[PDB]
Design a protein around this ligand. Structure first.
Ligand SMILES: Nc1ncnc2c1ncn2[C@@H]1O[C@@H]2COP(=O)(O)O[C@H]2[C@H]1O
Ligand SMILES: Nc1ncnc2c1ncn2[C@@H]1O[C@@H]2COP(=O)(O)O[C@H]2[C@H]1O
Lengths: 501, 501, 501, 501
């Protein structure tokens, strides 16, 4: 077959493809650019390249841990399970090197992804090739075959000891697969959606901890490699501590201890570096370790300063309220009422509701405000018998207000400018020469003055912690010009009060 | 009786209940949902659940300190005061496990608190049950009864030593009460109002210090437990230091030292971990300790950057003023006057007075501005003989201005746009062809040009550090259309000057 | 005399007095409230209390360094120069205790400073009295006189050794003068103007370094005091190190080393605390030292993040410009021109010129803008022959614009909306059917279309990096209604071009 | 010749000269102020002073490394290659001292650069002269000639040992060239354009690392100098460690270790400072090292908090969206749609497009918006047949909107206020009593209601993730008054629908 593997090479339809391209037709035009780019070409957003590069991450983390251990702590390991492990690993890192000449390269300077196989070839050779070519081919296994052709007797003389010390240096060229480890994680963590939705301070602090553990692991093997290459001199940490003929569990464990002590800021065990090699390795690990630890405090600080923001923003605003009250020296009763205001108005979290609504689409501002005001719509007798466009056009105009008990919301004998809807609590309409009356959750007041452009006719005073909704004059005249049929309903209720008045 | 205990199960009336629900009637509807939820059901905001969970915090902090000490440092403690201490403690952690099936669960996805006892049951079993069931029942005391039924002779053989080493591992299942310690502090610190009013950087840094001391205490017992379970091998820190047969005061004290050295970044006393157990415990404590210490620097930095904000905001603004003056290379006399401006205008603290007033309710902006301008109202002869709505409608329009001596506030022969009230100091009305005259604290100028829409008639020049109040034209015409009776008083005073002119 | 000392008790006239009170008359009313408050009363802002509390800072820093040294490191020092040093010091700390009942107390809840001597007395006894009464009287010298009356033979028995160990504990009550050290620095650093003008991050980091050196000095004496009070046990750091009979230079030096090692995160010299006293002192100093060091990183971070702000603000804005250009994938030539824009428009520092001007007084916006545009005023032939109010009313309207070479500033055949003044460089007026002409620094263009409300008549194209000034139509019509005499001058020049046209 | 060297003394024409002065003529006036300032005067921005001060940076870094090494670790080095190295170095630091009296001094208080050679002379002597005069002349080589004249026999007695210990103290006066190292880097890093374009957090952290390595290098020589000047006492670190007669490779290496341990927070190798000199040097290096390390954490934190800003700003906004949705307890379907909104509207990066465009010049807003809308212009049939000023005046008015599928963009029977252009996807015009029809990328809807000022005539419902462009009424009436010829084209298309209707 030739069809079913072409579906893996071209970017399929999911959420990511849509996000990258817009409509589904833009993906369908992209899926035809893959097939028209030549035979057997890989698109980088496709499902093959995502699940190929996932298996290479599970192979590099295998070979960046097992390789620097099996070179040092085993003084001769050329058994069958080890060489097969290196040949199988060298197979995938050649196939990965082959498939990089067929993968499209994302250019951050144009809107196109290059799928011409020659332009892919000329960009890969210039930027990351030799680091991915040295780490691909088995360099150590070539050199033993080449030195076999150079000299047949290179296994008997005193040169043979130098070659084996030269061989383990060449097999550390396979640690250049960190360059493919780093690139295939930055490309993975953006595409993978659960890491794309995490905060960037959480993502970078995981990449650091994965790097601090890996550098401490390589350093732990390097504290044992450099004395081992020097045939364990009589001043090296390994000799004095008498760790030449222990198991490879302890050697590595003690070496990891020394590296972690040098890095994490602790002091080594009274073995003041006494040999030049040891002094310069410890000074290497002290500088490397204290730099990675100071970058760990930098990420941990940036993570903490973006944990709990709204509350921070509520308290930073209220601290400016507190210092404003002491600058003008308010009485402590008015300081108590203003502190009773913010925890009843804002309830501990301060959002900027105007911008959060305004960035959204209209069809979503109509949906949120129709959800936030369901306790007002279902309780009022006005809104259950109205046009649903009228209800949505009303609720977008309102603004939320809080009045403490004892406050005069409307003073009689002023010019009216707002209309009030009662969400919570009861108020007291105080009438000149008549009995006071209460209004409940769902009654509305402040409409007589807006229909006549006159002055206020009665006092309104809060009794509970009333949470009201305000409607200005300019919005009230604008809504009725759209819907003149709902104008007469307010004229009916305003006829009733002026009757009672 | 059955009545008086029902008053503890339902949420009573206080500030917290009102804050959570709004009006008192919303609490009264909530108190009937408790009684209609079945027999003997606990509401989580009620006064029983607050003072039950306060006693459990005073019991868990007892049992998360005494239990990890009395297991390790006492090689056999099955006396009467110890077992009674564990049976009494296991009674409350079963009753706490029973009462969790009757407490309402706060859902952060709906507006309702579930009080149906079956839906409480099906949520508690899924999230935090087995951690609260293992830590509830005495697991170690069951296993001795079970092993008694398995083998009657399990106290004489060499298996008996293995069982006692197996017994102390099971009694460390009681350290899972940290999961109930953490949950019952987050629920406590939000309800308790003196911790709800503290900053979140102060709250999280207390929870960290309580956790750093507890982890250092468990680590201090763990440095002694793991050698004790291994029958004190001849390489363990305890042997070399010769601390096998000291008092349990020293054993614990020396162990706490070792843990604090490993954590707080210091180095241990020349005892380079020489036994695998000791190497991996020290490496455990170095990673745990340096992570908690780096999080301590992160909270201490976030606390310091939100200590003194206004002044920070005054100085960050004035540093932008300083660099603006050096960018344009002002003369040093004008740099001196502008530095004399900010400390007389702002006095070292810079508030944003417009937003701090604007977030409040109108009945509070009328109360603050009527307090801030009492020195202006009581000193002017205008305001003591006026309507109190007129005084409040005037004072909401004014804006605060500062003029240094020598400055010309009003130049003669321009178009007038503002009116001035004198709070502090004296000015000099310079008249074309007449003698200069002074105006004092409470006189007002700049009203002749607003009544006639003409041009300026005289010069006004500052003599002291005058703090004035400004009133624009558009506000001045608006206030007089409300109150035309106060229009004639300004016409009387403007008749006097033009007479003197 | 009784007059000349009254001038020290009342707050004199300087910059600070004026800043605290406003006009000089407000100081003169304050100077009469001092004299009318009773006989011999101290005002806290006066020149006596400033220079009294300056000498006490130079005495407390003497006695918080010399006292904790001379108690410990001298096993018996009751010589004449030592006791005279303590009696002279105890004289000033009684007089300072007497003068605190006559100093006015600043209340942060009212606008008044209390000068009633009874209300001063009732506030001082409640808040800071016993800490200033214990540290005032010589407590150790009383106890030797009292024990002389208790038992005449208290110098011969074995009780006499216990009394001398009890005596040095009582003389450490004089370290409560830190409470007067801290209060008299917070009151000093606000009044002293060179510390009031420093940043608060610079002030708090100096108070910390003064506290870290003092805590390390007390800790250095405490590492030697507690073994000295225990008669130097055979496990104490002093014995093992063999420092019992050295000079008091070394004892103190070695002790300061140990304290600094425990605090600054280093490890002590192989002397793992081997005595309970030593373990709990080292654990005391490790917690105290690592807490003060973590607060040092917190202040050093907050200092660095407010060093270089404008440039930070220029680069944080331009980084948003850089990521905006790569998000839309601009060509690299347009990326080069936009990078050439910001360094010619903003020149590396980005100020918010609108708010920095707007917070100032008008008489200062008239003075700065008349300084920033002196190269425009002196070079134009228009402004040197005009009214100085007209020049100031023109320059407040202008806005600053930058055009790169090749740009078309004005395209012929559009509706004109702005007028241009040339500060730097030359432009090319391209005329339909006529020869191009240049305009120099001080010529102006874009006024023909504003006098006729017609359309554009010619093209204008930049040749150099022109820095222009823009004047809108609405401002241009407004200025000419004030000054109609300068309207005809632009009509003359517009007559010339239309002649040449 | 005298001409060709004058071209190096005067500031040439490049980007920096233009940035500092404006137009090229302003440079040409500056190049004549150099020649008119006297004979042979150096302008500080010129190409001679840039490449002179670059060679001195490559000489000071030579002599601040080689000098503190060759003094200490060589107990007598007066060979020919050493003295020639000091005489050649003392030649350039005299010529650099001579050329500082001819270089113009930048004054941060005026707009002029002083080129009068007397005012250059009187400013250099007051600020940085004696530090540049002591470090210039060979002070040690004078003192041997002077002491030769004082006493001819000063080489034989016991005074001769004191003179050689006095000689190495005088040759450390050459470390005052750090004052010329610091000044010539701040002047270099501003002029050099690749360091002027880096962030200031990146620049200051490189200057710190260059200072931390240099202070650790001087400290490493100071740990060996002070015992060497004291003839290696029997308690000094050098003796006990037995490092008196090793090579100068080890001496220096071991000393650098000790300094780095004291600074980087590690502990020294069991050599608890046992000699007063050693105690006070270690305490010197602990305070110096922990201060430079705490400043390293401060810069590393400030670097991390300005790495990835836009995404931070996208996520900090969306976290406020997340907490707003849980505060009002939205259903999880509406939480899913709003999360589908932001990643389709903003695509993970949130720019403030209004301010980023508004700070630019008009000729650049015309160029960017003509680039961002090329997919709209080339696809619509309207824009390919229009005036290019009309296309640019249209595209500056549009605003970008996103509608999810199922949303009703336009509801039939409302008042029309906007016009829509389709960039991506298809919509469904739902017609009362007629068949639905689709519109594609480049068709436009919402123009019938704007030409008649009537109400909406049909429903429009989204089908894909439509990215639209909005055009308001007030902008639509304004553009047609400029171009009435394009008014009739929309009237033609609106005639077609009302025909189909
Ligand atoms: N007699 C009354 N009974 C009930 N409500 C009243 C009475 N008089 C006034 N009101 C309400 O008080 C409001 C004050 O503002 P309006 O006059 O605009 O509208 C008025 C009514 O809503
Ligand atoms: N019959 C129709 N066929 C196509 N488009 C239509 C039809 N009726 C209305 N429209 C479009 O729907 C738009 C709704 O707003 P307008 O009436 O302003 O302009 C209208 C046209 O763009």
């Amino acid at each position: 077959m030739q069809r079913q593997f072409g579906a893996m090479l071209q970017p399929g339809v999911n959420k990511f493809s849509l996000r990258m391209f817009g409509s589904q037709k833009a993906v369908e035009r992209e899926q035809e650019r893959v097939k028209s780019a030549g035979f057997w070409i890989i698109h980088p957003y496709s499902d093959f390249r995502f699940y190929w590069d996932l298996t290479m991450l599970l192979l590099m983390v295998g070979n960046l841990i097992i390789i620097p251990v099996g070179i040092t702590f085993f003084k001769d390991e050329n058994t069958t399970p080890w060489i097969v492990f290196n040949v199988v690993s060298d197979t995938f890192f050649l196939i990965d090197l082959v498939l990089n000449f067929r993968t499209g390269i994302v250019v951050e300077d144009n809107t196109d992804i290059i799928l011409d196989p020659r332009r892919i070839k000329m960009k890969y050779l210039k930027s990351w090739f030799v680091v991915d070519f040295v780490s691909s081919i088995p360099v150590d296994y070539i050199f033993l075959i080449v030195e076999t052709r150079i000299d047949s007797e290179v296994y008997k003389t005193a040169r043979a000891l130098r070659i084996v010390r030269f061989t383990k240096i060449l097999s550390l060229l396979r640690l250049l697969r960190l360059s493919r480890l780093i690139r295939y994680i930055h490309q993975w963590e953006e595409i993978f959606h659960m890491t794309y939705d995490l905060a960037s301070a959480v993502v970078r602090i995981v990449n650091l901890i994965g790097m601090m553990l890996l550098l401490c692991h390589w350093d732990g093997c390097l504290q044992f490699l450099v004395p081992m290459l020097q045939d364990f001199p009589d001043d090296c940490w390994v000799s004095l501590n008498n760790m030449v003929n222990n198991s490879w569990g302890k050697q590595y464990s003690y070496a990891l201890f020394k590296a972690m002590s040098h890095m994490l800021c602790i002091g080594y065990g009274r073995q003041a570096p006494m040999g030049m090699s040891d002094v310069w390795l410890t000074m290497l690990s002290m500088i490397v370790g204290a730099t990675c630890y100071a970058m760990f405090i930098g990420h941990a600080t940036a993570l903490i300063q973006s944990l709990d923001s709204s509350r921070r923003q509520y308290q930073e605003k209220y601290k400016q309220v507190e210092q404003y009250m002491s600058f003008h020296k308010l009485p402590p009763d008015t300081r108590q009422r203003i502190h009773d205001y913010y925890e009843h108005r804002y309830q501990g979290k301060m959002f900027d509701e105007e911008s959060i609504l305004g960035e959204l689409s209209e069809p979503l501002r109509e949906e949120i405000i129709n959800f936030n005001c369901r306790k007002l719509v279902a309780s009022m007798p006005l809104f259950a018998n109205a046009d649903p466009n009228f209800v949505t056009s009303m609720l977008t105009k309102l603004r939320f207000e809080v009045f403490q008990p004892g406050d005069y919301i409307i003073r009689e004998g002023t010019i009216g400018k707002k209309m009030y809807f009662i969400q919570h609590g009861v108020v007291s309409v105080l009438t000149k020469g008549n009995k006071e009356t209460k209004l409940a959750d769902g009654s509305y007041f402040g409409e007589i003055c807006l229909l006549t452009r006159g002055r206020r006719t009665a006092s309104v005073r809060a009794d509970t912690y009333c949470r009201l909704y305000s409607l200005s004059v300019d919005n009230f005249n604008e809504v009725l010009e759209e819907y003149p049929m709902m104008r007469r309903a307010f004229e009916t209720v305003a006829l009733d009060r002026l009757d009672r008045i």
